[PDB]
Structure 1
Amino acid sequence: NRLKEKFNTEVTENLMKKFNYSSVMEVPKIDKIVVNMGVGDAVQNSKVLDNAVEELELITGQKPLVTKAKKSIATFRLREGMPIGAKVTLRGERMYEFLDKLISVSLPRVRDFQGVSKKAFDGRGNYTLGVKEQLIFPEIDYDKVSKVRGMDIVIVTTANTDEEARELLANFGMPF
């Protein structure tokens, strides 16, 4: 829990001094991390979805929830209820471990890495990072990766503003 200790000690004080919070309860914290992989080609081959689920489980450490089509779409040849995605929700120590791992071990493995988008904030203190290659993450061996596919990592924070979310993520160590 090195990242959690950093947040408790240094990030809390830095952010509180910067934003002049009358109480400690106003200090933003990362509520959760949702790792989602949308597999639309599962319509044509469910084995692709199975491999995606296995890879996501390896990356995250817990079994993913399979997400199914909310509605039927003719153009995509998608029927309501067909599993077309996977999602994992990380909270607490697992979330912090994944966050530090993503910042340190995983992100630099991007070819020609030049930082992550600083504008990828929903407008209310939540940050979405679009990774384009599962091979980034250390737990995956490229030999067993039948196909390369990306992920969406949604860091949901208690910060009310993009400015505070940016400060929190930067103090954690997010490149930009």
Structure 2
Amino acid sequence: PKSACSLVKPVHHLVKIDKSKLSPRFPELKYDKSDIRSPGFKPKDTHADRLNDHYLNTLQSDLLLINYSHNAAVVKGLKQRAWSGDSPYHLNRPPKNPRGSKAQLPDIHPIKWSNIPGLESVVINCFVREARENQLLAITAALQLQQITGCKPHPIFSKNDVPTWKLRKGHQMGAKVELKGKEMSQFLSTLTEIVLPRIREYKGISNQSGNRFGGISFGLTAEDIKFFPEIDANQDSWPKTFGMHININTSAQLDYQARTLLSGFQFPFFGEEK
């Protein structure tokens, strides 16, 4: 190679060129995944969704009313500070970090008819630490996820080398899955309706849980996983079962709004709130 010097030549027109349409290659990837001609086609709306219908029919209006605040205004977040131009050395100086944080934080807008909180995704994390010695437990965990949820699990691979825990790097330690729409609706419905009621001593979810910008996380143990219908039906095929974390990601601007939304979906809360 004569040189390593990236440089994009400017154009003389405003027409946007996508070369995937000019290449005769990959004819079947030109169709959208929603197009019946695409091999990636998968029917989406096969049946009505009770949880979504309930949220659209009842909870949107109630949440709007509850979160209404008169003459509210946007609360801007911690952003990068700017150097005052009292010294020449400030001319090309990069901006300063936010006051309390090394990362910028989002602004909080008043709740209005267009931005009511709602569920956007659910992610299940299953990290079998005992899979460090046995790689097959990862496959078992993936099957547990597939049976509980119905979606394709994705493997989790070790990234750090910690000797005290005897954790190497590049090995399969478990599985994950992300849920949206009817599938997450079903997963949450079955959780609340079957599994959580069958836990020994269950008070709810901690009121001091969740990332500070919307999203609530809580865990389940192996005995708790045994309550799901699929496992109970064929106990024989489940000598061992694994726990997992559950992360519910919503549109809530702050965590307490998400807590109210989940309580609407019947998720109990026990601790004292921040």
Greater RCO, CA 8 A, separation 6+: 1
- TM norm. shorter chain > 0.5: yes
* 2:248 counterpart of 1:159: no
Give me the TM-score of the superposition, normalised by structure 1.
Answer: 0.92
Percent of aligned pairs sharing the same letter: 34
If each structure's strand is expressed as a fraction of its own residues, which one has the higher value? 1
Aligned residues: 176
Written as runs of structure 1 = structure 2, the 5 A alignment for 1:1-176 is 1-20=49-68, 23-133=112-222, 134-141=225-232, 142-176=235-269
Could you tell me how far apart the structure 1 residues matched to 2:244 and 2:160 are? 22
* TM-score of the superposed pair, with normalisation by structure 2: 0.61
Deviation string, structure 1 residues 127-160 (Cα, Å, up to 9, x no partner): 0011113113222133322223211010011101
Q: Distance in 2 between matches of 1:96 and 1:16?
A: 21
RMSD over aligned CA atoms reads: 1.6
Q: Is the 8 A contact 1:129 1:152 kept in 2?
A: yes
- CA shift, 1:22, in A, is 6.0
Contact residue 11 and residue 172 of structure 1 kept, 8 A = no
Q: Tell me if the contact between 2:144 and 2:241 (Cα under 8 Å) persists in the aligned partners.
A: no
* Structure 2 unaligned residues grouped into runs of 5+: 1-48, 69-109, 270-274
Over alpha carbons, which structure has the higher Rg?
Answer: 2
Alpha-carbon distance between aligned partners in 2 of 1:60 and 1:90, rounded to the nearest angstrom: 8
Considering fraction of residues, name the structure with more helix: 1
Instruction: For 2:216 and 2:119, locate their aligned partners in 1 and report how far apart those are by CA, in whole Å.
Output: 10
C-alpha offsets along residues 91-131 of structure 1, whole Å, 9 cap, x if unaligned? 11111111111111221111233333232222222100111
CA-CA distance at 1:51 after TM superposition: 1.3
What residue ranges of structure 1 are gaps of 5+ in the alignment? none
Q: Which runs of 4+ in 1 moved over 4 A?
A: none
